[PDB]
Amino acid sequence: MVILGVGYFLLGLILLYYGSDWFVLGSERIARHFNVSNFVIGATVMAIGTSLPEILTSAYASYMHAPGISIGNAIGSCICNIGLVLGLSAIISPIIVDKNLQKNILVYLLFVIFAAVIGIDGFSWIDGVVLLILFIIYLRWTVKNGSAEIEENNDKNNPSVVFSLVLLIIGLIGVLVGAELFVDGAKKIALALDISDKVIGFTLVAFGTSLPELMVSLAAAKRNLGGMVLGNVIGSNIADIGGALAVGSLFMHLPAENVQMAVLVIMSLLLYLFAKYSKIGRWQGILFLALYIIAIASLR
Ligand SMILES: CCCCCCCCCCCCCCC
Ligand code: NA
Ligand code: NA
């Protein structure tokens, strides 16, 4: 069993590594094809793609009468995206945020503050419907503001668009399967070593759901695509709240997570202030990483 486990683990790392880059490359080309910014493609296609694990996990957990895990994982993912993912990415490729993207981050901040407020006494299915609708509105508003598309499908290099789309799809298949092989491999190794417990198990799952955002953003950062990185942090958090958290609330009332929500609000405000008045570079990234470390050391 340890052999299959090692095999799954290594293969997962390989698929994550090359899949993340193919996903980024395909997504960037697609953005160019359809006259939208990297932020837009990051906040829509890439964000949703990489958040599929959180959404499925939250749905499953709530359906299995574990709403605490459902909301814990969703908000935990948001803290990870800003703290670890953006933190690492900012150092690799410092990001200067233009005016239009600043506006988008501000709207993101309003969304998070709104969710924190209505979730003070937990989330009901009605809160979830509301958050889901706002999720949809955000996406359309983001696409419309970030698209200077001024041509029809007949104006494009359609065979090139096909290649880009296939690269994107295969990339995404790579990162999602890779993330799952990683988790299952590590679980098999832990089981084989007789060191598996529920703490290690849930830690493995929680981190597994975040591996796609992590690898994709790092891949984007190494290619100096800061707008894509930023899009795929902001969009993932909204998809995690408007999508993963909301869908969880549809199966069961979710318990309040006021401490984690407060942390997310503060990190979001920080992110906005940096975007608006400075940059998201080395010491901003250092700060975000320090806050993430404090979070994983002290949050229950
Ligand atoms: C860059 C990848 C390096 C992998 C190094 C692996 C060393 C042995 C790791 C055992 C991990 C066990 C994980 C489940 C507890
Ligand atoms: Na995502
Ligand atoms: Na994810």
Curated annotation (Swiss-Prot):
Residues passing through the membrane, by range: 3-23, 39-59, 77-97, 106-126, 128-148, 163-183, 199-219, 227-247, 254-274
UniProt GO cellular component terms: plasma membrane
Protein family: Belongs to the Ca(2+):cation antiporter (CaCA) (TC 2.A.19) family.
Designated name of the protein: Uncharacterized membrane protein MJ0091
Keyword RNA-binding set for record: no
Keywords: Cell membrane, Membrane, Transmembrane, Transmembrane helix
Gene3D superfamilies according to UniProt: NCX, central ion-binding region
Membrane topology, as annotated: Multi-pass membrane protein
GO BP term, example: calcium ion transmembrane transport
Annotated InterPro entries: K/Na/Ca-exchanger, NaCa_Exmemb, NCX_ion-bd_dom_sf
Localization per Swiss-Prot or TrEMBL: Cell membrane
GO molecular function: calcium channel activity; calcium, potassium:sodium antiporter activity
Pfam families linked to this entry: Na_Ca_ex
Superkingdom field: Archaea
